[PDB]
Amino acid sequence: QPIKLARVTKVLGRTGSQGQCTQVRVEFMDDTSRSIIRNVKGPVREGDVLTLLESEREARRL
Amino acid sequence: VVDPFSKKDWYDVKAPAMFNIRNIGKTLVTRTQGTKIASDGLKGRVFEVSLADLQNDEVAFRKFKLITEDVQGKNCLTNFHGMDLTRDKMCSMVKKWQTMIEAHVDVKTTDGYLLRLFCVGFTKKRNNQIRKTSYAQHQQVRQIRKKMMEIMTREVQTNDLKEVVNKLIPDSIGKDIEKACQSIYPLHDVFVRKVKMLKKPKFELGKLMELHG
Amino acid sequence: SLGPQVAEGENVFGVCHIFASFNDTFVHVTDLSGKETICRVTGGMKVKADRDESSPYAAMLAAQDVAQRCKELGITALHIKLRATGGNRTKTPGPGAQSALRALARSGMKIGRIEDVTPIPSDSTRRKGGRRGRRL
Amino acid sequence: TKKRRNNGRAKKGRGHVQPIRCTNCARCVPKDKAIKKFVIRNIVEAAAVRDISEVSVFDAYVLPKLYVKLHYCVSCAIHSKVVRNRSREARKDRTPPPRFR
RNA sequence: AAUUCUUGGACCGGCGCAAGACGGACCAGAGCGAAAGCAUUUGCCAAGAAUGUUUUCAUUAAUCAAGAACGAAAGUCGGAGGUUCGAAGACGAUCAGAUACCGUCGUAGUUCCGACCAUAAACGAUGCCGACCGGCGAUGCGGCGGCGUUAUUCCCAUGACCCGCCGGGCAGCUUCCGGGAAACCAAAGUCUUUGGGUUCCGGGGGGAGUAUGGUUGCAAAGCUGAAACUUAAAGGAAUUGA
RNA sequence: AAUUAUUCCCCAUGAACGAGGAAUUCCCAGUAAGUGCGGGUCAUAAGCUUGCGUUGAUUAAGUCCCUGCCCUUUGUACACA
Ligand SMILES: [Mg+2]
Ligand SMILES: [Zn+2]
């Protein structure tokens, strides 16, 4: 599947077992309106880019 | 050490003229090896097809049962057996703070077929209603149920099976009952929940081949 | 081994009865009639341990073998008839229901129409276990 | 000592209510004593929906739901954390917990 | 996990047939009943509270020793039935042991008809009748008044909502009515400012609901029911700890 | 006063050890670690400890999953608990 860019728009909350994954609201650079929720490792900032291997799957919001 | 699907003929299934999409799908049978015959073993198979698939595209919550009452040649000819609403629909309708009214009539068509029709209807909450409940008193319930039976009998009794299926393809019976019971207590989610087949007349072929065009 | 349907567009439909108890999973394809069986791969045929007959894993293996087995006979798409145990017992499907339905969609089949067909009784016979239930 | 006013149950002016089998055990609890719960669930969980949204023959077929009504005995309800113990003051609060999302 | 079931095709899918149980969701702090209790449709039979009344009789009433009707479940005797479940049983596990909890079968029973039985945390742990004493919003049945919406299109008139009022009923929230050891209670109030009427019944804890007689029962057992002896506490609500 | 070599020096002898099993420790900035220099003991005297500077990072700005301890609610026939 083509690799697609999701842009962090608003960092929401921290998740995982040991508080290790930042759960972030992403706004797609490809489609104008589609905004999904993704679990992300490492430190992430409000207003930067992610390279998603799939642009359809969504993580369970808490 | 015998591949058991080597001796299997596929047969195309045909629905009667009352539906848009004719052919339902395919059916497996064993080749006539010994005394027991492919077509005779194939005769009396019940196919439960959703009306969405049976028409082109519509309601998917109403299902029709169809019996292969005869086989002409590489073609199963099905005929209306029964009808049933889907679990999802019936479970979704039945919700709390209202009265559920159920009727059943044992009525016979002009030709041999004697059906058992089950009607269901739920008391509707008014547009400006502030009272939570919206229940019907017992005499209001059995006046509604008496009227349910009176329409359900009248609609089938006087015409033949080709026309009763033409009424069950929409829900003309349920819409007629719903409008009729507006004075006693306004119902909303009124359908003919289920149609059963108790008796058929002794099989004819000329009567089948009028239903198959 | 020859469904004489058209190569381009024509989908040949089966119907898959996924009986998912809390200690076994069945995946069982038949005719639209429901009379003639094509496949039946249980959760227990695949794995050899009693404690994981009702596994998402075992149900995933079972649905994969069913998908592969029915692709050869020429069943392209499937209608679905999911059920728990029912009667007096549980009416929530087993933990293998999800993984099996997922598995024969990951394995390149087509999904027609789905519905619950659990034996829901009007009112039933007395349930197993005493008046005081299953105490543990 | 008297703990509840309505003796842990929603019977007031009957005398007898027919019992029900618990859905975890098969323990006989009265119809109104039991902790009832109505689970409306999608057949396919969360991610399976996307795989069956693409590998479906039809055009926007709103895949069906699973309606299951569950009766728990008080012990089964507390053990499964369907209910919990409460303060003497909070016990009287009958307004069910908010389900905003 | 094993006991058990199965290539003499079990479990699974399909179409039929038979049997005996039970009446899901709708089903609620809703209804009815003296209490136990009572839920698929329709018909027949007799009864009933509440409301309505410018009808009738005119004290006929309230509570009750004796005596009497009904009385869940289990239990007993005789007949019919035996699908599910299942005391005793038989094994399979678990454990130090397990005569248990867990599992596989499973007899009496579970169901109906006719005779006994008469006890339950039979509970509101709260006799029945009558009067007075705060507030509020719902709810079920009956009656009454009232903008308007809606179904009979043809709207008079009937139902479905809407807003109040009156009488009974299941309840609810609130309060320095007042009471109480407190918990809590519009009754558990109107109690040292003690009397409206009337039935049952308690007198520190054990022995003991035991022995003995008498009585009812086919039996199990029911009703009535002590003493010697023993003991400084047992107990009820609430507080701080652990 | 040195054999059971106090220490130090000179030549000769050249062992295992090829990055370490279960398990487990300390640590977020001039910090970890590498590196040496002083103080203590001290007639003799640092593989220890207590201080000092020099070179100088990777990772993280989070959580209750693990191990601890601490609180609130609830239950009690416990109160030398
Ligand atoms: Mg009772
Ligand atoms: Zn339980």
Whether B130 is covered by a domain: the verdict is yes
Q: Between vectors from CA C20 to CA B63 and to CA D56, what angle results, nearest 5°?
A: 50
Which nucleotides of strand E lie within 7 A of protein CB? 1-2, 11-16, 20-33, 35-43, 83-87, 101-104, 110, 124-125, 138-142, 148-152, 158-163, 169-174, 183-185, 188, 236-238
CATH architecture of structural domain A1-62? Beta Barrel (2.40)
Report the structure determination method. Answer: cryo-EM
CA-based torsion, B49, B53, B54, B58: positive or negative: positive
Residue C133 CB partners (closer than 8 Å, separation 6+): D22, D24, D25, D26, D27, D73
How many whole angstroms from C122 Cα to the centroid of ligand 1? 27
Nearest 10 degrees: CA dihedral of B175, B176, B179, B182?
A: -110
Which of A12, A34, A56, A62 should we substitute to test contact with D (largest number of D Cβ atoms within 10 Å)? A56
CA distance B163 to A26: 57
Q: Greatest CA span in chain B, whole angstroms?
A: 74
Residue A30 CB partners (closer than 8 Å, separation 6+): A4, A5, A55
In DSSP terms, C79 is beta-bridged to C15
Where in chain A are the domains?
Answer: 1-62
Distance of B169 CA from E114 C1′ (whole Å): 56
Distance of C84 CA from E22 C1′ (whole Å): 22
How many whole angstroms from C12 Cα to the centroid of ligand 2? 46
Whether B1 is covered by a domain: the verdict is no
Whether B150 is covered by a domain: the verdict is yes
Q: What is the DSSP letter of C50?
A: G
Give the β-pairing of B75-85 and B9-14: parallel
Judge: D50–A60 Cβ closer than 8 Å, yes or no: no
Whether B143 is covered by a domain: the verdict is yes
Total count of domains within chain B: 1
CA distance C134 to B64: 42
Residue A51 CB partners (closer than 8 Å, separation 6+): A3, A4, A5
Residue D69 CB partners (closer than 8 Å, separation 6+): D36, D37, D38, D39
Q: Which of C118, C111, C43 is nearest to C76 (CA)?
A: C111
Total count of domains within chain C: 1
Residue with tokens 């099996």: C100
> Resolution of this PDB entry, in A?
3.4
Q: In this structure, what CATH number is given to the domain that contains residue C86?
A: 3.30.420.80
Residue type for C123, please?
A: D
Distance from CA of A57 to the nearest CA of D (A): 7
Domain span holding position C67:
2-136
- For B53, which residue in chain D has the nearest alpha carbon? D58
Q: Between vectors from CA B174 to CA B171 and to CA B180, what angle results, nearest 5°?
A: 140
Residue type for C83, please?
A: R
Distance from CA of C121 to the nearest CA of B (A): 13
CB C135 within 8 A of CB C109: no
Distance of D77 CA from E120 C1′ (whole Å): 28
Q: Between vectors from CA C127 to CA C121 and to CA C133, what angle results, nearest 5°?
A: 140
